[PDB]
mmCIF file of all heavy atoms in Angstrom:
data_model
loop_
_atom_site.group_PDB
_atom_site.id
_atom_site.type_symbol
_atom_site.label_atom_id
_atom_site.label_comp_id
_atom_site.label_asym_id
_atom_site.label_seq_id
_atom_site.Cartn_x
_atom_site.Cartn_y
_atom_site.Cartn_z
ATOM 1 N N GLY A 157 -3.988 6.371 0.678
ATOM 2 C CA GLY A 157 -4.337 7.733 0.230
ATOM 3 C C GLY A 157 -3.133 8.431 -0.384
ATOM 4 O O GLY A 157 -3.309 9.123 -1.397
ATOM 5 N N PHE A 158 -1.954 8.249 0.213
ATOM 6 C CA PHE A 158 -0.704 8.871 -0.289
ATOM 7 C C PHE A 158 -0.373 8.325 -1.688
ATOM 8 O O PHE A 158 0.033 9.107 -2.567
ATOM 9 C CB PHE A 158 0.424 8.630 0.714
ATOM 10 C CG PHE A 158 1.607 9.540 0.538
ATOM 11 C CD1 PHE A 158 1.691 10.728 1.245
ATOM 12 C CD2 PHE A 158 2.623 9.220 -0.344
ATOM 13 C CE1 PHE A 158 2.779 11.568 1.087
ATOM 14 C CE2 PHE A 158 3.706 10.070 -0.511
ATOM 15 C CZ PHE A 158 3.784 11.237 0.209
ATOM 16 N N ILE A 159 -0.536 7.016 -1.893
ATOM 17 C CA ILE A 159 -0.268 6.400 -3.226
ATOM 18 C C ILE A 159 -1.216 7.001 -4.266
ATOM 19 O O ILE A 159 -0.740 7.385 -5.343
ATOM 20 C CB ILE A 159 -0.410 4.867 -3.151
ATOM 21 C CG1 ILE A 159 0.751 4.249 -2.369
ATOM 22 C CG2 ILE A 159 -0.532 4.263 -4.545
ATOM 23 C CD1 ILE A 159 0.559 2.791 -2.022
ATOM 24 N N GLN A 160 -2.498 7.126 -3.923
ATOM 25 C CA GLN A 160 -3.518 7.609 -4.892
ATOM 26 C C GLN A 160 -3.443 9.121 -5.141
ATOM 27 O O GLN A 160 -3.985 9.548 -6.180
ATOM 28 C CB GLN A 160 -4.912 7.206 -4.411
ATOM 29 C CG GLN A 160 -5.154 5.713 -4.560
ATOM 30 C CD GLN A 160 -6.541 5.302 -4.144
ATOM 31 O OE1 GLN A 160 -6.929 5.427 -2.985
ATOM 32 N NE2 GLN A 160 -7.283 4.751 -5.090
ATOM 33 N N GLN A 161 -2.758 9.890 -4.290
ATOM 34 C CA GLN A 161 -2.754 11.371 -4.479
ATOM 35 C C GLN A 161 -1.338 11.939 -4.634
ATOM 36 O O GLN A 161 -1.203 12.954 -5.338
ATOM 37 C CB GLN A 161 -3.367 12.051 -3.253
ATOM 38 C CG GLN A 161 -4.772 11.572 -2.912
ATOM 39 C CD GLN A 161 -5.161 11.921 -1.494
ATOM 40 O OE1 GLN A 161 -4.708 12.913 -0.927
ATOM 41 N NE2 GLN A 161 -6.010 11.094 -0.902
ATOM 42 N N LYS A 162 -0.331 11.302 -4.027
ATOM 43 C CA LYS A 162 1.031 11.899 -4.009
ATOM 44 C C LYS A 162 2.076 11.039 -4.728
ATOM 45 O O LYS A 162 3.267 11.360 -4.586
ATOM 46 C CB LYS A 162 1.434 12.145 -2.552
ATOM 47 C CG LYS A 162 0.427 12.949 -1.740
ATOM 48 C CD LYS A 162 0.103 14.314 -2.311
ATOM 49 C CE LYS A 162 -0.963 15.023 -1.503
ATOM 50 N NZ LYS A 162 -1.237 16.375 -2.033
ATOM 51 N N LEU A 163 1.666 10.021 -5.485
ATOM 52 C CA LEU A 163 2.663 9.187 -6.212
ATOM 53 C C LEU A 163 2.592 9.532 -7.698
ATOM 54 O O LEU A 163 1.493 9.436 -8.282
ATOM 55 C CB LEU A 163 2.390 7.696 -5.979
ATOM 56 C CG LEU A 163 3.359 6.732 -6.663
ATOM 57 C CD1 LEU A 163 4.789 6.952 -6.193
ATOM 58 C CD2 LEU A 163 2.949 5.287 -6.424
ATOM 59 N N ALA A 164 3.723 9.946 -8.267
ATOM 60 C CA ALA A 164 3.793 10.285 -9.706
ATOM 61 C C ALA A 164 3.498 9.046 -10.552
ATOM 62 O O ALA A 164 3.868 7.931 -10.119
ATOM 63 C CB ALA A 164 5.168 10.815 -10.014
ATOM 64 N N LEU A 165 2.813 9.213 -11.686
ATOM 65 C CA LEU A 165 2.634 8.039 -12.583
ATOM 66 C C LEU A 165 4.041 7.574 -12.968
ATOM 67 O O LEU A 165 4.885 8.448 -13.228
ATOM 68 C CB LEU A 165 1.815 8.422 -13.817
ATOM 69 C CG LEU A 165 0.409 8.944 -13.533
ATOM 70 C CD1 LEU A 165 -0.271 9.380 -14.820
ATOM 71 C CD2 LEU A 165 -0.423 7.898 -12.816
ATOM 72 N N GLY A 166 4.279 6.260 -12.982
ATOM 73 C CA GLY A 166 5.617 5.706 -13.265
ATOM 74 C C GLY A 166 6.380 5.466 -11.974
ATOM 75 O O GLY A 166 7.387 4.736 -12.007
ATOM 76 N N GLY A 167 5.900 6.044 -10.870
ATOM 77 C CA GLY A 167 6.541 5.872 -9.557
ATOM 78 C C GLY A 167 6.349 4.462 -9.025
ATOM 79 O O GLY A 167 5.495 3.718 -9.568
ATOM 80 N N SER A 168 7.104 4.113 -7.986
ATOM 81 C CA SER A 168 7.042 2.750 -7.397
ATOM 82 C C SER A 168 6.971 2.837 -5.871
ATOM 83 O O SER A 168 7.262 3.911 -5.304
ATOM 84 C CB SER A 168 8.225 1.921 -7.835
ATOM 85 O OG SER A 168 8.205 1.705 -9.236
ATOM 86 N N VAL A 169 6.623 1.716 -5.243
ATOM 87 C CA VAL A 169 6.505 1.669 -3.763
ATOM 88 C C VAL A 169 7.034 0.323 -3.268
ATOM 89 O O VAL A 169 7.004 -0.673 -4.045
ATOM 90 C CB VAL A 169 5.045 1.856 -3.297
ATOM 91 C CG1 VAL A 169 4.394 3.081 -3.910
ATOM 92 C CG2 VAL A 169 4.186 0.625 -3.570
ATOM 93 N N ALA A 170 7.510 0.330 -2.027
ATOM 94 C CA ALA A 170 7.926 -0.880 -1.284
ATOM 95 C C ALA A 170 7.351 -0.685 0.122
ATOM 96 O O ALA A 170 7.885 0.171 0.855
ATOM 97 C CB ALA A 170 9.422 -1.049 -1.296
ATOM 98 N N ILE A 171 6.269 -1.405 0.439
ATOM 99 C CA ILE A 171 5.523 -1.230 1.718
ATOM 100 C C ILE A 171 5.639 -2.509 2.540
ATOM 101 O O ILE A 171 5.203 -3.568 2.053
ATOM 102 C CB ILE A 171 4.044 -0.889 1.447
ATOM 103 C CG1 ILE A 171 3.861 0.247 0.437
ATOM 104 C CG2 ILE A 171 3.314 -0.619 2.757
ATOM 105 C CD1 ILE A 171 4.504 1.559 0.834
ATOM 106 N N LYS A 172 6.147 -2.394 3.765
ATOM 107 C CA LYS A 172 6.335 -3.599 4.601
ATOM 108 C C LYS A 172 4.993 -4.071 5.173
ATOM 109 O O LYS A 172 4.199 -3.248 5.680
ATOM 110 C CB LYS A 172 7.362 -3.346 5.706
ATOM 111 C CG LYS A 172 7.796 -4.595 6.459
ATOM 112 C CD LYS A 172 7.038 -4.894 7.722
ATOM 113 C CE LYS A 172 7.556 -4.110 8.905
ATOM 114 N NZ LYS A 172 8.996 -4.365 9.144
ATOM 115 N N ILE A 173 4.779 -5.377 5.062
ATOM 116 C CA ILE A 173 3.592 -6.079 5.612
ATOM 117 C C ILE A 173 4.119 -7.297 6.370
ATOM 118 O O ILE A 173 5.315 -7.622 6.235
ATOM 119 C CB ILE A 173 2.605 -6.513 4.514
ATOM 120 C CG1 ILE A 173 3.211 -7.574 3.586
ATOM 121 C CG2 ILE A 173 2.096 -5.304 3.746
ATOM 122 C CD1 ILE A 173 2.198 -8.311 2.740
ATOM 123 N N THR A 174 3.241 -7.910 7.152
ATOM 124 C CA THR A 174 3.545 -9.169 7.875
ATOM 125 C C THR A 174 2.256 -9.979 7.845
ATOM 126 O O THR A 174 1.279 -9.493 7.249
ATOM 127 C CB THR A 174 3.996 -8.930 9.319
ATOM 128 O OG1 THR A 174 2.887 -8.394 10.048
ATOM 129 C CG2 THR A 174 5.197 -8.017 9.411
ATOM 130 N N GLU A 175 2.245 -11.144 8.483
ATOM 131 C CA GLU A 175 0.982 -11.916 8.540
ATOM 132 C C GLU A 175 -0.152 -11.034 9.075
ATOM 133 O O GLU A 175 -1.223 -11.022 8.450
ATOM 134 C CB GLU A 175 1.133 -13.123 9.459
ATOM 135 C CG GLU A 175 -0.181 -13.850 9.686
ATOM 136 C CD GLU A 175 -0.087 -14.997 10.666
ATOM 137 O OE1 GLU A 175 0.948 -15.083 11.365
ATOM 138 O OE2 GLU A 175 -1.055 -15.794 10.726
ATOM 139 N N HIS A 176 0.096 -10.289 10.158
ATOM 140 C CA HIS A 176 -0.973 -9.500 10.828
ATOM 141 C C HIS A 176 -0.957 -8.018 10.445
ATOM 142 O O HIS A 176 -2.007 -7.372 10.626
ATOM 143 C CB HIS A 176 -0.883 -9.685 12.349
ATOM 144 C CG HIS A 176 -1.167 -11.086 12.779
ATOM 145 N ND1 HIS A 176 -2.445 -11.517 13.090
ATOM 146 C CD2 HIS A 176 -0.353 -12.149 12.946
ATOM 147 C CE1 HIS A 176 -2.401 -12.785 13.439
ATOM 148 N NE2 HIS A 176 -1.130 -13.202 13.346
ATOM 149 N N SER A 177 0.180 -7.494 9.981
ATOM 150 C CA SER A 177 0.252 -6.071 9.574
ATOM 151 C C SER A 177 0.028 -6.001 8.063
ATOM 152 O O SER A 177 1.005 -6.078 7.309
ATOM 153 C CB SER A 177 1.555 -5.457 9.999
ATOM 154 O OG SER A 177 1.580 -4.075 9.699
ATOM 155 N N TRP A 178 -1.229 -5.874 7.643
ATOM 156 C CA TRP A 178 -1.555 -5.862 6.196
ATOM 157 C C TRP A 178 -2.866 -5.106 5.987
ATOM 158 O O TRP A 178 -3.601 -4.891 6.979
ATOM 159 C CB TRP A 178 -1.659 -7.295 5.666
ATOM 160 C CG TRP A 178 -2.879 -8.004 6.163
ATOM 161 C CD1 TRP A 178 -3.043 -8.587 7.386
ATOM 162 C CD2 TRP A 178 -4.124 -8.187 5.463
ATOM 163 N NE1 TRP A 178 -4.299 -9.119 7.493
ATOM 164 C CE2 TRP A 178 -4.986 -8.891 6.332
ATOM 165 C CE3 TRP A 178 -4.591 -7.840 4.193
ATOM 166 C CZ2 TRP A 178 -6.284 -9.252 5.973
ATOM 167 C CZ3 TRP A 178 -5.867 -8.211 3.830
ATOM 168 C CH2 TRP A 178 -6.702 -8.903 4.709
ATOM 169 N N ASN A 179 -3.167 -4.773 4.734
ATOM 170 C CA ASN A 179 -4.395 -4.003 4.419
ATOM 171 C C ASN A 179 -4.917 -4.464 3.059
ATOM 172 O O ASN A 179 -4.118 -4.545 2.108
ATOM 173 C CB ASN A 179 -4.121 -2.503 4.540
ATOM 174 C CG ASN A 179 -5.284 -1.655 4.078
ATOM 175 O OD1 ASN A 179 -5.485 -1.476 2.880
ATOM 176 N ND2 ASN A 179 -6.024 -1.091 5.018
ATOM 177 N N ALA A 180 -6.211 -4.775 2.999
ATOM 178 C CA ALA A 180 -6.877 -5.264 1.771
ATOM 179 C C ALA A 180 -6.828 -4.201 0.664
ATOM 180 O O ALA A 180 -6.615 -4.572 -0.509
ATOM 181 C CB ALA A 180 -8.301 -5.641 2.106
ATOM 182 N N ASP A 181 -7.011 -2.926 1.022
ATOM 183 C CA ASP A 181 -7.002 -1.839 0.002
ATOM 184 C C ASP A 181 -5.600 -1.692 -0.599
ATOM 185 O O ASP A 181 -5.518 -1.386 -1.804
ATOM 186 C CB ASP A 181 -7.513 -0.515 0.574
ATOM 187 C CG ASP A 181 -8.997 -0.538 0.893
ATOM 188 O OD1 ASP A 181 -9.748 -1.202 0.146
ATOM 189 O OD2 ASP A 181 -9.380 0.064 1.913
ATOM 190 N N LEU A 182 -4.548 -1.893 0.197
ATOM 191 C CA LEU A 182 -3.170 -1.787 -0.343
ATOM 192 C C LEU A 182 -2.959 -2.878 -1.405
ATOM 193 O O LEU A 182 -2.375 -2.568 -2.458
ATOM 194 C CB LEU A 182 -2.164 -1.890 0.803
ATOM 195 C CG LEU A 182 -0.699 -1.823 0.380
ATOM 196 C CD1 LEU A 182 -0.395 -0.505 -0.302
ATOM 197 C CD2 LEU A 182 0.211 -2.040 1.572
ATOM 198 N N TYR A 183 -3.397 -4.111 -1.138
ATOM 199 C CA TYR A 183 -3.279 -5.184 -2.162
ATOM 200 C C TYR A 183 -4.067 -4.788 -3.415
ATOM 201 O O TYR A 183 -3.564 -5.006 -4.536
ATOM 202 C CB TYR A 183 -3.781 -6.521 -1.623
ATOM 203 C CG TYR A 183 -2.785 -7.328 -0.835
ATOM 204 C CD1 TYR A 183 -2.879 -7.465 0.541
ATOM 205 C CD2 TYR A 183 -1.798 -8.042 -1.489
ATOM 206 C CE1 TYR A 183 -1.985 -8.256 1.250
ATOM 207 C CE2 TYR A 183 -0.907 -8.848 -0.800
ATOM 208 C CZ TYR A 183 -1.006 -8.967 0.574
ATOM 209 O OH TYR A 183 -0.121 -9.769 1.239
ATOM 210 N N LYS A 184 -5.271 -4.240 -3.224
ATOM 211 C CA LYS A 184 -6.111 -3.788 -4.366
ATOM 212 C C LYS A 184 -5.310 -2.760 -5.182
ATOM 213 O O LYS A 184 -5.326 -2.854 -6.425
ATOM 214 C CB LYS A 184 -7.444 -3.221 -3.861
ATOM 215 C CG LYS A 184 -8.414 -2.790 -4.953
ATOM 216 C CD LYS A 184 -9.720 -2.204 -4.447
ATOM 217 C CE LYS A 184 -10.548 -3.180 -3.641
ATOM 218 N NZ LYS A 184 -10.902 -4.384 -4.432
#
């Protein structure tokens, strides 16, 4: 939700995931 509403166009992200700590919508 933060990426879709509070990230400026041109902005970037680095989100930590692991085998079990992950989200299908984040990959989308």
Side-chain angles (χ1 to χ4, degrees):
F158 198 93
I159 289 169
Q160 288 182 296
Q161 304 162 29
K162 307 302 177 178
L163 181 60
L165 300 176
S168 296
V169 309
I171 311 301
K172 190 266 277 302
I173 66 164
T174 67
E175 173 184 13
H176 295 270
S177 184
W178 71 280
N179 173 282
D181 291 325
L182 179 61
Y183 276 107
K184 183 181 297 301

